[PDB]
Amino acid sequence: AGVKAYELRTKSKEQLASQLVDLKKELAELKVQKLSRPSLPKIKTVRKSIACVLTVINEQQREAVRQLYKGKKYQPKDLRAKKTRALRRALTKFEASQVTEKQRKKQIAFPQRKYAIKA
């Protein structure tokens, strides 16, 4: 059928690495058998299985580093928010909202008063 990522996320590094080696062994064995028989679709889910194991392995490694750098500035660029180059270079919400003390005392004193005309 194929291994499941939600299962692998309960397994440790040594279990997953061992799970990877015998899968690569199964794939290597299957590629030998690919020559003798015309069709063998089992090779597809073994490649999927190999990909699933590598997906979770990378996920724990990336998560491991994520809280290693947690709480301090200068996370790795590969860990940072990708969104877009121009968005990344845009002023922050704090920096774009900054005003001078002169402006601040004017905004406090005379804000846009809410009113209505009656008649």
């Binding site: 928010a81 969104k83 877009t84 968005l87």
Partner: protein, 81 residues
């Protein structure tokens, strides 16, 4: 002898495959691509060559990263799951 017998003398390629575009337009002795202008940093283009710009613009290729930006923009450049 400018016709048929002269055509038999030509066996030295003057252009080879360009690195930036695989076109066979990289001039060997000028070290330039007549199509894309490699190794200049910009790509060779002209507003008088409208067909030429249409042959290699954005969308003629895979847009391996650009095909996804609109979907990423519509979801508001989110992070998480």
């Amino acid at each position: 002898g400018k016709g048929t017998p002269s055509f038999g003398k030509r066996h030295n390629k003057s252009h080879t495959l360009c690195n930036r575009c695989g076109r066979r337009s990289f001039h060997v002795q000028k070290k330039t691509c007549s199509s894309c202008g490699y190794p200049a940093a910009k790509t060779r283009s002209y507003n008088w060559g409208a067909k030429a710009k249409r042959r290699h613009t954005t969308g003629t290729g895979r847009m391996r990263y650009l095909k996804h930006v609109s979907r990423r923009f519509k979801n508001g450049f989110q992070t998480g799951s």
